[PDB]
Amino acid sequence: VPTGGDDPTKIAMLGLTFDDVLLLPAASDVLPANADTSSQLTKKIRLKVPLVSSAMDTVTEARMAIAMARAGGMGVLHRNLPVAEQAAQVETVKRSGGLLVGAAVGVGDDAWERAMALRDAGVDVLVVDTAHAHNRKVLDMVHRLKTTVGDEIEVVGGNVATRAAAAALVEAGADAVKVGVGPGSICTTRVVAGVGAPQITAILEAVAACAPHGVPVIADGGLQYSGDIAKALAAGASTAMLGSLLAGTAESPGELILVNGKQFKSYRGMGSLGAMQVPEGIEGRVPFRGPLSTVIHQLVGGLRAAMGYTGSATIEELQQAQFVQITAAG
Amino acid sequence: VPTGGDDPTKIAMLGLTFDDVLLLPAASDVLPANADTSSQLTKKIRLKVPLVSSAMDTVTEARMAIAMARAGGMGVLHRNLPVAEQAAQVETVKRSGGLLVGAAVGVGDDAWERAMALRDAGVDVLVVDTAHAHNRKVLDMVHRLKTTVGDEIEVVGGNVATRAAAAALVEAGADAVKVGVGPGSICTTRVVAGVGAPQITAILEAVAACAPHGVPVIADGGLQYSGDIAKALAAGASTAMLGSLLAGTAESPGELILVNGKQFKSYRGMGSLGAMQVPEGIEGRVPFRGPLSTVIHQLVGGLRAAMGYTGSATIEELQQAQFVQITAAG
Amino acid sequence: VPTGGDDPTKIAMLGLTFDDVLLLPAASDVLPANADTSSQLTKKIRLKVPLVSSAMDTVTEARMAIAMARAGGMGVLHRNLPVAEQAAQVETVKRSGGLLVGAAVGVGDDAWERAMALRDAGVDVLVVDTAHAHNRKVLDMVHRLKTTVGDEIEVVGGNVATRAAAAALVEAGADAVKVGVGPGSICTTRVVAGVGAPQITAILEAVAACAPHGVPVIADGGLQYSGDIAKALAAGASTAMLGSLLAGTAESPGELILVNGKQFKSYRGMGSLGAMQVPEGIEGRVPFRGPLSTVIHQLVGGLRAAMGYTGSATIEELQQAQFVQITAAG
Amino acid sequence: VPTGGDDPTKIAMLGLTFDDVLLLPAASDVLPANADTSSQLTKKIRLKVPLVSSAMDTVTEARMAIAMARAGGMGVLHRNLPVAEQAAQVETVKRSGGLLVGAAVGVGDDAWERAMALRDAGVDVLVVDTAHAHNRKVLDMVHRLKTTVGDEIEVVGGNVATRAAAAALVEAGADAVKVGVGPGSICTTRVVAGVGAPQITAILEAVAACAPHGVPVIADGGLQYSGDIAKALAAGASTAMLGSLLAGTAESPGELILVNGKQFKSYRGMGSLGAMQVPEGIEGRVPFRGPLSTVIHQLVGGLRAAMGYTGSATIEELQQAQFVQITAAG
Ligand SMILES: COc1ccc(CC(=O)N2CCN(S(=O)(=O)c3cccc4cnccc34)CC2)c(OC)c1
């Protein structure tokens, strides 16, 4: 084996991240303005815009969830707060008209009660929210939820970064599989644990397990530009979950921060010291970006442009687009 | 598939940019001073110097087109202005003696009238000027022009970055095919849409469709050094179109700008906010470089040196030269 | 041969370093808190924590060796001092309770006497401490020690970076093989001699020679993050030796240094001018990191997290984990 | 073809530079202090140290040639000065005892007279000094010299970067072949002409043509560290020619330059504007490094260390050593 040892499987793959690829233009009669950006969030739920906001306490509370739904996407309410408060945020969103909303739950002792209070509050999507879903406890929680409240509520499981893990979630009954172990902008799992999977390869592998079962893949983490959304969807994802790209918006939690004459907002991992109070996330800042509506417009604008270049009339068509791999120089 | 999924065609190629390759020296009895730098701009038009200036409003108006033609190249007048003004710039150039000149047209509602006014003004080359020529409207415009005024005017179509797109333009009747989707120095399509094709690979692919039909390829975008011109031509292109490399010259539109004691000129994408007034270009600055004549001398000087090292007596010979691929370290 | 010449073996392999790979998550029912971090230092000695401190005079004297042993690892006392002083440091450590301790010896004229004084002082591990163990003198020293005092003392040999060198040490009787030629943070062998071997590949190759004989591999040098420890062990190493990561701790030799309002400690190669008084190491500084106990907690915390993600209940299981290779972009 | 087009030979090879490889350690009983560093400069001339100084006017005049010869290497006197002055510098060197000296000649109108005046002055080596030796005029000059004065004077030809070019020089009668097109530290040929060949691959290819005919290869350009000398020789070169590494020494031409409290000397390409008065070199500065004797000691010290690690008792043995290819991360 050229990289060492005698086992070809020790280094199992070459992992590509968003920056490693570009979408190839293709024959097109699709105008960006006329592309259909709708896509499946879950088996049953289709969004007008294929974007959801991260379940993080510097990204999504009621104000963000409301704005996301109004923009045609959805918010996933974070779970770093008491059960009654999270359920009350669900109520606040559903009060704002017929708006879709999701909410994160863990697999700990209080997770089941949290999920039931969220169901009672009228949540549409429960996101079983972990860093490693390939685990009997996580799979059992997914299955239990789907068998208990699965007629009225869609159940997302995550996160995974391998084909086998995605397959396990599908088998457990997941209505969507969320992909991303290590790619988050505020993630230090890569350096702390030495664990991760570049996101283009992780999406390609997850989709290989999920698409044949009609289960949509949510690409979660590592998206830095509007172009990354197009790349994630072309790799086979049905939606993208965004943290950093939405953390600078007016609707995110947190105050404005002024440093060196420029405006920022705090953005922190849910595995950072501050969020937990061995951290696997940092506490950082992102530039202030203004109203969510405007950020989403620009992001969807880039997606539309990609659909124009690739001749993709729908997201389903975009999922069939081809990449070129680029070098460091490119 | 080593990079993920089960489809070998999902990642269709490995795309090289100019910085990924160098020209290999070869047996040579050609002195740089004695090389023949002439090359086909179109099927019928041969330039003394294989360089054309970008159809941009911070690069080519009448003054630049005149200087380019006098230097042995050609200018393509930009189309970000009323039809009567563009046609009047064509008249200004043709007034300066028997000078070649080209002009850009779109495929919008006013494009046909623009093209006819340009024909009436005595233009030699019409450039159907788009970001994505693999499109029925663009192909139809190319064909219509070629069938209507194609006896007296040469019709360039662009831009493309794939073999199939180049093939479609050839079939539509293009007299030259312009290659470049995403490589421009002021381009943000790569980040905004996630779309592009590294330019060496894009030229190799386009030439594979165009050369067998005797249709010249114009390499447009991404050329940063005189050496890139040699590389583009060796990859099979017949001419190169330059924006950034010519934007700093006295003959380009725009005022001198002084920042931190150094001189610059404004250089902006035609897809930037300022040019359009979701942008796919930026508004920037390039160092002031002095008279066009001197910049072209240096650029052709580098090309001549390359022809010396590779034993290329003509451009046609240079198109047969070989590359070495280099690593990040090199 | 694509990279030149006609000999495919001239460039013998593609060497990967820690930054070239990530651990892939795998099915897991292992909680980080419950993983077993114990591992073989030598054929006979098992540590609670798979970490040893470098035999360097800015890393390990008695204070560090005591703290390392108490944390469940071990210190290797450096040999840049008189024999009586080194032996006295061994005595100081053994005085602090039943604590494991190792000590470095060379292969020079005074090396045998040094090793016997260390044996008399009650050392548990002798580390034949060289930059190139594939050498008859080093192999002979290893063998002599193992045949003379090998019933009561374990003999480590190093350093190596190839399969053949590791094999030679095994055959000489080594109880453990230490791997690392050129990767140290303060190493300049790579630039001075042009010699080295990227550490993931070097570990994979050494383990291929050592594991089939039940000889543990110590990964020495190049570990910058807690995640690198997990990577080294997954590549097949049984323990990791750390210099830079432990040099900033309270227990390391040397004074606190204040520059630009921040705290540092001196950290220098044993091949630096200052340590020797043609240098193959530099004299540098590392940030002050506080008590050893806390640094080890964080490092083991990262290892535990990796064992969680990879479903490794023990180190032996972690040694079977798989990598993904990443690009420069990732 | 994965990188574009249908011609596998268009991109002829993957070129490696010094930074792309490291020497693998090997079984060794060679102490650095006892290695034999002698090597063939030409078919007939063997140096004690395998290093020659560049024929540049900021590197080698009489003072440098004398110091190089005394250190066991050789200087090649530059040719950017009148014939009588260059010949007089040869006389100055031969006056300093039995010291080897070389001198550059071109292939221009005054080149033959220059070569004869140098022969009359007692030169030992004539270096036919060009940027592209694969040319009938250069090959003819080499042959003419070898047939005219080749009994008493050794004739070096260069520079080349391909197997075919090296083969042509061998056939012309070269006593040594000098390799390097584009790698020099002050070289801009790569950017100006887009022409070059990474030096490890260029040496491997040249050696493949030269070694079977017993013609030594001189590695010229791109050597930044003492370790690069070992790498060049292991790739098959017999000696290395150094410019930048020797330009900072007391014996180089030029004054001391003080900028920002640090000492420098001027170092400029022979293709820079200043040396010629379309430039293919820059005018720069290198740190002042003190006496040549000390720089050579450090450089040979690194070479010796490499011979120690690779078990090379002689240079001839070092030429058989193996590389590992490294990634950007390494
Ligand atoms: C098999 O048993 C296990 C397996 C794994 C863990 C780790 C774990 O649960 N956490 C808590 C969540 N974070 S995170 O906030 O930083 C995070 C949040 C969402 C997405 C992530 C994606 N990649 C990295 C971190 C992510 C990481 C550490 C575990 O802990 C008990 C037990």
Ligand SMILES: COc1ccc(CC(=O)N2CCN(S(=O)(=O)c3cccc4cnccc34)CC2)c(OC)c1
């Ligand atoms: C299939 O239907 C489509 C397909 C594509 C588009 C995009 C489009 O027409 N534009 C306007 C031109 N720009 S540009 O100025 O930035 C530009 C100018 C020239 C060369 C370029 C090369 N690569 C990138 C940008 C370039 C990009 C956006 C579209 O819009 C209606 C409709």
Ligand SMILES: COc1ccc(CC(=O)N2CCN(S(=O)(=O)c3cccc4cnccc34)CC2)c(OC)c1
């Ligand atoms: C075959 O004969 C030989 C072979 C090799 C050597 C070199 C040698 O012994 N030394 C002394 C030790 N250093 S070091 O302190 O920098 C060092 C310390 C530990 C680990 C290292 C890992 N990689 C690099 C340097 C390392 C390098 C130079 C030699 O010298 C007489 C004789």
Ligand SMILES: COc1ccc(CC(=O)N2CCN(S(=O)(=O)c3cccc4cnccc34)CC2)c(OC)c1
């Ligand atoms: C086939 O006919 C030819 C072919 C080639 C040339 C170029 C040429 O002779 N020169 C003059 C020498 N320089 S240089 O000083 O910069 C130089 C000096 C030594 C080593 C070099 C290695 N790589 C780059 C530059 C180098 C480059 C330009 C030519 O000119 C008439 C005619």
Ligand SMILES: O=c1[nH]cnc2c1ncn2[C@@H]1O[C@H](COP(=O)(O)O)[C@@H](O)[C@H]1O
């Ligand atoms: O602390 C953390 N460490 C690692 N990943 C995190 C952490 N907090 C949230 N995440 C994940 O990172 C995603 C946001 O990634 P981003 O959009 O690149 O900033 C989130 O949706 C989570 O999946």
Ligand SMILES: O=c1[nH]cnc2c1ncn2[C@@H]1O[C@H](COP(=O)(O)O)[C@@H](O)[C@H]1O
């Ligand atoms: O706004 C823009 N975005 C992307 N490409 C542009 C834009 N404006 C012009 N171009 C293209 O970029 C080329 C100039 O590239 P440059 O020489 O690298 O600066 C032009 O000839 C166009 O093909």
Ligand SMILES: O=c1[nH]cnc2c1ncn2[C@@H]1O[C@H](COP(=O)(O)O)[C@@H](O)[C@H]1O
């Ligand atoms: O001077 C030196 N040059 C090269 N390697 C050294 C030197 N001193 C110690 N080492 C090795 O570098 C290791 C520490 O590497 P680090 O943890 O990356 O700093 C040590 O355990 C030695 O194996």
Ligand SMILES: O=c1[nH]cnc2c1ncn2[C@@H]1O[C@H](COP(=O)(O)O)[C@@H](O)[C@H]1O
């Ligand atoms: O102006 C120049 N342009 C390109 N190469 C040059 C020039 N002048 C000298 N050289 C070559 O560069 C070598 C020195 O390379 P260096 O040791 O990397 O600085 C010289 O021996 C020449 O072969």
